[PDB]
Design a protein around this nucleic acid. Structure first.
Lengths: 206, 262, 37, 143, 100
RNA sequence: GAAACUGCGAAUGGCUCAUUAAAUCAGUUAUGGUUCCUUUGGUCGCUCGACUUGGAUAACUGUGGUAAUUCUAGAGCUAAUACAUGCCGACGGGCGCUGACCCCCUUCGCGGGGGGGAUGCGUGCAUUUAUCAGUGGUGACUCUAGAUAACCUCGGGCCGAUCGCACGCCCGGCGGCGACGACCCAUUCGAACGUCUGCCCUAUCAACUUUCGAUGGUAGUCGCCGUGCCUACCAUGGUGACCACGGGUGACGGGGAAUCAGGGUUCGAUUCCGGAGAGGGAGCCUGAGAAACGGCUACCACAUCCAAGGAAGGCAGCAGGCGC
């Protein structure tokens, strides 16, 4: 059907090839997955050798990684902002590999607070009134507190990250082919990558 | 071709089988196994053509379905099972044991061995490997995977394995000054002492071999088998002892034995 | 079988590593030989 | 200077967001006695298809032509000359076969007429299968 | 209950086609009005619609509720069970057996 | 032991040469850029949380349809290595975080140094992603192993609800040969797409290719994988008198054949290897492998049987008939 072959298109010299055989199967080709954002929907494609290949047609969750301290959590994709290849893949917000998405910052914040015993986001004059957040931020023995005061030293977050946390949504880049593995796994944008992409989103936006 | 091929025509059959033309159209396409299609000896060929125990492929079928023939200490009820190099074929009811090692010419000789020698075989290691728990792995020339080997054995050595346990006893390192039988190319069956190895990064490394009588010949490294340390082979050899004398010498020896018979 | 193969390898390997370590101290013996023969 | 294309250009193996308180570079010697040149180690360019600072393995053939054209993007046309031998007339005939070959920005200045050594790699584009590995400046070319 | 008969050309009424005419379906394995010869085989079959109408030749009817009166033909007798349970659990289930 | 369900095979073999001129094909190399039924060998109490489960169907029994075919509808009965669903084990812990609390020695005292350790969460291989370290190997890995933080497709990876012979070994105790099956690994059989060089006549074919892919760059999509294969945005390129582009072949390629002093010329549909096709094109199901035609679905050409509503086609298989 959808042919994936070299013999259908002109030689290096601009001379036409006359096809010496009809379409073979291994010269295969199938329609594009076109993965949207919605409730989990995955169809299975049986491929050469009797192996499987999962078509994610809708996805909500995704395994994203805060790379600077090896904090990976399953979060909830909310929307797409910028795609490098094509900008109709933004309009009809398709999930493809290496597209910029926004994710829920809540599992990263929860880990950050429970690891450093310091607040992240939570704007000045934050009423922490359930006060089991204050349990996670206070009430230790002696030597355990020494370990936690030792560690809070190197919890200096990049201001670019700290804004996104306080807004409540982080930028991430999809590192897995979602149309072939049925997964929207990626990494949270940081440093020079983040400054590059934040310029690109603002510039395009206007 | 829309899939794997199952018929092998008699003219396409490997030449070392010495199959006659006017018998049929086909030869026995060897069933998949440890050795390659091209370089094996199918059990029907060895049993019917070489030994002359059977006359037809149906007679060979009638033998091999009584569990008589044992290849490498396991019963093989497949008449086109590929029996290749170094393989040990023990028939119990007759009380006879054969090791398939090459004639001095490019074919398999029918070399009888003793009950005590038909208990092991030499395997050329093909690739060393680490498994899924830092467990080291060997792969041999006859498709055997041996795990937890000796930590010195490397990619071109020879190992002596036992045909009950399938475990490594002793091994011969691939060095200069070690006996090697040549198991591929023009020099097929030539025994000699390794003189040199010539390294070519990206290409096939050629290895110089010295025969007993000062005959020097090269072969690609792949087609060499270290069968002994020094001049001492760890197996028994056919009559000739892998020299491959010239055609003028073979004539002289033939008509010497002829005229002596008279 | 898994247990006995692991135990027999541990013996043979540890012996081969003792051989290499006897060589390791000859490596340092070659260092000090180049230092003061 | 770099990152002209819409997607962020990085050597994808090296990680550049290690918390602290120069950028590192990934490269390799590509075997067969080729000196991984100085610009590979001390450049700040990004290339998928550089044999030194990229994901291509050199294996198979090592051929050599003269640089003919340098008018396409990180690619050049070399011209390979040989003598084909006709059998009837016990003489030769001068033939040629010019191939599109991938030039890394590693080799900073090559001039049309320079001698190139090329290593076979996987198919890089429609017609590109070879990589420039060392350049030998044409007869003299000092001034 | 209308178990579904045939057309007057023998084209049997396939379930859930929801028409009163005759139409063409591409029937695979696991369908009615068809069985494949080779594995993975499909076939165009002319089948009569589901909607029972005037121009049939048969109607398969199954007696859902036995009525007030008794028929001479059917109800009078009762055919025996050819076979019974072959599986051990089905024997224990039918005849009500303890475990020991 | 017929029938039927299940499993496998039907992709080989055979036939013909219409296509096809760097295509096919031949030698030579690459997969460190892939998939692989079968075979042979590894693996299969590595995982810390039932002395055998479930509801359908065939053959069978019976009731039928239309003129017709290897068409099949309806009812009642029953199986599994079909189709589903699932324990118990070994199994007591081990390792990694968490961490009540605890005792110890020093500073009179804070602080300090190391020790034990409740509760909780995690764990195996494969799979997807991110980070750290540098047992075995290569000419060269972004290799193989190892370590940490998560994932796990409900159209769902594994972690035996299977069958046959021999019957045994002590107080209702107590195990060997095989058959079959399986995620992963190597191996065998291959296949696939690439590398270098090589082909007949033609100038009354000198310029050709491209904004609907022509040559390159970046990021995707798709595929078993590498790639303009195809999307989007960029760049102006690629080939040519060393014959490109176009046209012709009574052209499938080669091993080979006839003829020959030495050179050569002509042939090679034809039994071996490789390719392509099944009336002409196109599209697909099943399977490890098919764009299969002694598979299915259309249209074009032809054409058989009709109770006129419909049913069924494919000899360049072996024979054989017409036409030529």
């Amino acid at each position: 059907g959808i042919s994936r072959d070299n013999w259908h298109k002109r030689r290096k010299t601009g001379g036409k090839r006359k096809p010496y055989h009809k379409k073979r199967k291994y010269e295969l080709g199938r329609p594009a997955a076109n993965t949207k954002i919605g409730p989990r929907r995955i169809h299975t494609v049986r491929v050469r050798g009797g192996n499987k290949k999962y078509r994610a047609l809708r996805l909500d969750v995704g395994n994203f990684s805060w790379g600077s301290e090896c904090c990976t959590r399953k979060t909830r994709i909310i929307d797409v902002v910028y795609n490098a290849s094509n900008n109709e893949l933004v309009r009809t917000k398709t999930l493809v590999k290496n597209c910029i998405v926004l994710i829920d910052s809540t599992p990263y914040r929860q880990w950050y607070e429970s690891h450093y015993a310091l607040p992240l986001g939570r704007k000045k004059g934050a009423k922490l009134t359930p006060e089991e957040e204050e349990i996670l931020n206070k009430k230790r023995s002696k030597k355990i507190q020494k370990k936690y005061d030792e560690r809070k030293k190197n919890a200096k977050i990049s201001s670019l990250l700290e804004e996104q946390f306080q807004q409540g949504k982080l930028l991430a880049c999809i590192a897995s082919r979602p149309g072939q593995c049925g997964r929207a796994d990626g990494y949270v944008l940081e440093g020079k990558e983040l400054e590059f992409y934040l310029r690109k989103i603002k510039a395009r936006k206007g | 071709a829309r899939g794997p091929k199952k018929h092998l025509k008699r003219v396409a059959a490997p030449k070392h089988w010495m199959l006659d033309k006017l018998t049929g159209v086909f030869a026995p396409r060897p069933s998949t196994g440890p050795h390659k299609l091209r370089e094996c000896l199918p059990l029907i060929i060895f049993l019917r053509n070489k030994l002359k125990y059977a006359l037809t492929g149906d007679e060979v079928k009638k033998i091999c379905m009584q569990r008589f023939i044992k290849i490498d200490g396991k019963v093989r009820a497949d008449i086109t099972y590929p029996a290749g190099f170094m393989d040990v074929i023990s028939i119990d009811k007759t009380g006879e044991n054969f090791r398939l090692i090459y004639d001095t010419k490019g074919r398999f000789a029918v070399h009888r061995i003793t009950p005590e020698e038909a208990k092991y075989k030499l395997c050329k290691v093909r690739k060393i490997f680490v498994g899924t728990k830092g467990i080291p792995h060997l792969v041999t020339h006859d498709a055997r995977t041996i795990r937890y080997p000796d930590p010195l054995i490397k990619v071109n050595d020879t190992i002596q394995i036992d045909l009950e346990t399938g475990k490594i006893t002793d091994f011969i390192k691939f060095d200069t000054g070690n006996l090697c039988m040549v198991t591929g190319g023009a020099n097929l069956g030539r025994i000699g002492v390794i003189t040199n190895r010539e390294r070519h990064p990206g290409s096939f490394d050629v290895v110089h071999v010295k025969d007993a009588n000062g005959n020097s010949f090269a072969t690609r490294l792949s087609n060499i088998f270290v069968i002994g340390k020094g001049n001492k082979p760890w197996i028994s050899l056919p009559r000739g002892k892998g020299i491959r004398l010239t055609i003028a010498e073979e004539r002289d020896k033939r008509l010497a034995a002829k005229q002596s018979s008279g | 079988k898994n247990k006995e193969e692991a135990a027999e390898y541990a013996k043979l390997l540890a012996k081969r590593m003792k051989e290499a370590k006897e060589k390791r101290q000859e490596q340092i013996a070659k260092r000090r030989r180049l230092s003061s023969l | 200077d770099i990152q002209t294309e819409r997607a962020y250009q990085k050597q994808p193996t090296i990680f550049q967001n290690k918390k602290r308180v120069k950028l590192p570079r990934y490269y390799k010697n590509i075997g067969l006695g080729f000196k991984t040149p100085k610009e590979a180690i001390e450049g700040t360019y990004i290339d998928k298809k550089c044999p030194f600072t990229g994901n291509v393995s050199i294996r198979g053939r090592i051929l050599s032509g003269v640089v003919t054209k340098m008018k396409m993007q990180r690619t050049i046309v070399i011209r390979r000359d040989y003598l084909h031998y006709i059998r009837k007339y016990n003489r030769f005939e001068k033939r040629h076969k010019n191939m599109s070959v991938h030039l890394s920005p590693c080799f900073r200045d090559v001039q049309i007429g320079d001698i190139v050594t090329v290593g076979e790699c996987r198919p890089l584009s429609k017609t590109v299968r070879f990589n420039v590995l060392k350049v030998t400046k044409a007869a003299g070319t000092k001034k | 209950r209308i178990s579904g008969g045939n057309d007057k050309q023998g084209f049997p009424m396939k379930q859930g086609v929801l028409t009163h005419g005759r139409v063409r379906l591409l029937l695979s394995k696991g369908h009615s009005c068809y069985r494949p010869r080779r594995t993975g085989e499909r076939k165009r079959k002319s089948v009569r619609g589901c909607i029972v109408d005037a121009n049939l030749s048969v109607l398969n009817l199954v007696i859902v509720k036995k009525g007030e009166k008794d028929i001479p033909g059917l109800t009078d007798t009762t055919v025996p069970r050819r076979l019974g349970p072959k599986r051990a659990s089905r024997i224990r289930k039918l005849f009500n057996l303890s475990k020991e």
